[PDB]
Design a protein around this ligand. Structure first.
Ligand SMILES: NS(=O)(=O)c1cccc2c1c([N+](=O)[O-])cc1[nH]c(=O)c(=O)[nH]c12
Lengths: 50, 41, 99
């Protein structure tokens, strides 16, 4: 599980968040950073706001 | 594995490309003689 | 034992170094940085210069480290306060502090 906070270009909810499920409900910088490390280390994750 | 992965991203240049995208690529902004405009009148 | 390296602005040899034996032989930023570290640490420091005159890189043929890095892994040096860049391969062999 990933803990994060919403602030500007790091993490912000995606356009039409009503029609979204899971990790495809967020977009930003830290979103892409979370994606890169999860692959290199090797574990699936789930994003959650504080 | 995370600490070393961070160093793996930085040295190769993953962060630097990613920082260029969200700031600039996804952005909405962007001789000292007598000029012609001063005399134009 | 405190291993360092000779640089232009960091570790300078003072004038009249023959007339001053010990820690008075050198003066710079990196000398005072060690004193700040030993203000909150219980350790006795001796200004020891590395003999090779190298930072540290494992050769292709030998596959063995040299200099301040070489002294750390093989177990000779205790602490290293010097202008040393923190890279990927160094972290695999020796632990580094915060920048
Ligand atoms: N003298 S220099 O022109 O600036 C310089 C040039 C090239 C490599 C350097 C280096 C310095 N340095 O600042 O003395 C420190 C340092 N430390 C390391 O750990 C390393 O791998 N390479 C270096």
């Amino acid at each position: 599980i990933v803990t994060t906070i919403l602030e500007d270009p790091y993490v912000m909810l995606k356009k039409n968040a009503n029609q979204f499920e899971g990790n495809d409900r967020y977009e930003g910088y830290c979103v892409e950073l979370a994606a890169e490390i999860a692959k290199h280390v090797g574990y699936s994750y789930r994003l959650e706001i504080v | 594995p995370v600490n070393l992965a961070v160093l793996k991203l930085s040295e190769q240049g993953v962060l630097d490309k990613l920082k260029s995208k969200w700031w600039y690529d996804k952005g909405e902004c962007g001789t000292s003689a007598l000029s012609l405009s001063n005399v134009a009148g | 034992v405190v291993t360092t390296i000779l640089e232009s602005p960091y570790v300078m040899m003072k004038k009249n170094h023959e007339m001053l034996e010990g820690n008075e032989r050198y003066e710079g930023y990196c000398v005072d940085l060690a004193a700040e570290i030993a203000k909150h640490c219980g350790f006795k420091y001796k200004l020891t210069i590395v003999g090779d005159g190298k930072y540290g890189a494992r050769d292709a043929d030998t596959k063995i480290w040299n200099g301040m890095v070489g002294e750390l892994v093989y177990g000779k040096a205790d602490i290293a306060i010097a202008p040393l860049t923190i890279t990927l391969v160094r972290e695999e062999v020796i632990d580094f502090s915060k920048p």
